[PDB]
Amino acid sequence: MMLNEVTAVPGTALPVAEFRDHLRLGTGFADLGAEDAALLSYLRAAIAAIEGRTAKALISRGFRLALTAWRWGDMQTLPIAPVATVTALRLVDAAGVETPVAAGWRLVPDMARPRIEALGAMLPMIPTGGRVEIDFTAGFGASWSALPVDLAQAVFLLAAQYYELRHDGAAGAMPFGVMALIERWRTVRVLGGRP
Amino acid sequence: MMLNEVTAVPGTALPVAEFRDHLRLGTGFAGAEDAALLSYLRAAIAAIEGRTAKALISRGFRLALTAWRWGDMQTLPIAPVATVTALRLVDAAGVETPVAAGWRLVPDMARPRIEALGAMLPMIPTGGRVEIDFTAGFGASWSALPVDLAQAVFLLAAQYYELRHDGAAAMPFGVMALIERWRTVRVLGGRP
Amino acid sequence: MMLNEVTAVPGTALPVAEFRDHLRLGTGFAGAEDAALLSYLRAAIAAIEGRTAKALISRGFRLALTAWRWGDMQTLPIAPVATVTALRLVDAAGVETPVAAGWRLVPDMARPRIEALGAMLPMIPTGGRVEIDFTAGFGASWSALPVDLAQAVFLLAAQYYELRHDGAAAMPFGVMALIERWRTVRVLGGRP
């Protein structure tokens, strides 16, 4: 289970023109763009910080789940939570020659546990010495205006502290701080066991 | 179980004019444009409708779930509900056939629940999970809210405005003490 | 078990130009030459690739070990692996004969492990310990890293720059809170 992404966020979809207005930088100057390589450099470092604490995706890029053995009998939970329209389930063998399979797999969409849920009582069988690549586009929406706004506010509260202090300097968190906004987007799991 | 909403709230229904009268009026200076303020109220509505499981502007939802909990139940999570629109019951591909009888919406702030008539509830096909579109929330405007819940939005959106990053600064009826009576109090972590 | 790397990272692959844009840009003064900055990023990459057992620039390693752990295993320590080059199997003096079949690399961020086909793995001669050369890491450039791991390098290399000796000064997503999800979580201190 590798879970690398196919494409990344293009950078034009990040609200640098709004994160600049959040930082209270400056309005009517002839410069107005001296931090576009910087304000975008901390938005990518605060989205990807919250994607690791909440296991969310927030921009709906395309992923690829390359694994070698199905975890359970039929369900196969996906790590990244908000999923939609699994593009292709291919079933590779020992060397290349991938053959796509409709495969009777169906993707229950749920932000609790995004899983595949085989409908023929078994997931399609993996060849000996072969992988399985699930190609899917997981995330909230294609633009920034489709995010849940409490999660998008935690990105601005966090990327503004990477801006306003560069090295690791210690800073009482506010009622709904950074941690209190993402703590209803985290994954609440209580299974450390064999099944 | 996904529960995405149908349409977002327009912003012309949010009180960006009444927020600056909370923010700097009576005491202060008669600062930022409407797009900066409106980014902070819906960032404070979505922080309180997540902590209290409410809706506050009464937009339309779609709850699409794959298995009912009981056969006379499936409580709905977003709390103030009114007028469940349709109970669509798709098959696999989905020619998308709705049903129009068998259940009664019970409007209740405690457990907004769907409670089918008798003992049998509409079953689900193999693969064709059932979706519910309902319009949950207090009122279409902002003047239909409970005022203590509407004040804690203003007390929180003035916090997101007047201090930008996660910095330093509890009052008797604060933000937490006002939304502590709109939160869902449940003590079942069990099987049913 | 030694695990020395084949070639070090060149420095032209390290972002000495993008580090000073983190370090003094936007807020500050438009200080030190590139040889002073580059001595602090690789001193911060090697502090995080040791705490999280990662590689981050994808250089080539050589793992030379004397006994396999299981016969269907020997997990590799450096975590993001891709394209195990060769499984050389030297004898004593070592005419250095490679093998080319029997095992499958399983690319996995959890346990990058070598998992031979069937139940038998290539055995080791007396004295002729087996070496594995593999190329572990995220990407050849710096733009292929996870950005939270690349930010915690910049948050740490700006600490080694802006304060020289072990002096005085925790923020929510700090250096430790960003690399706490790339570290290896193991709870076997046992026999197998």
Partner: protein, 195 residues
Amino acid sequence: VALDVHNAASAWSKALLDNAARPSGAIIYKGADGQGVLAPEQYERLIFEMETHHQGARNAGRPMLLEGGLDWKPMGFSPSDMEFHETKAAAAREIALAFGVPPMLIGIPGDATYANYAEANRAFYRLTVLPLLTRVSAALAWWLSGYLGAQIELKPDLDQVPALAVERDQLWARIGAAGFLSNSEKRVLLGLPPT
């Protein structure tokens, strides 16, 4: 209800032996920070001095030098025996109480209600066997007799059944020792053909 307690309290122990984690201890490595993992050269070194020198029956009591940072916190297993043990045996006895066997007959441990198997096996063929068999044979006496004109009466013997011997002893010892009446008068009391 008592079958469901005995089936589940036996599956409690079957499960508890099969999916439960006791460790014999834990070797805490915090480090110079509050949190620190140990290096992969350090981790193979830590296992090899733990696998070879400190585990097994042959290594019970090695004095275990713990340098700075390390600590060995020994764990326990605080309910060891007796997981629903007295509510399973009490549920085992109510199963034996419903069908009507005495618990010494099938082998349930507990208090000796009956004494010495000449009582309990005599209480078994009188409270739950011979009342059951005398009405199965009473339905066979009436259903079969409808197939042959003459009426038939089937009933159990209560003679040369081997658990009613202590009942048959005190019948033969009472009438055998009561020598006031004649021999042909005590054959008909015991059920013998007169001579």
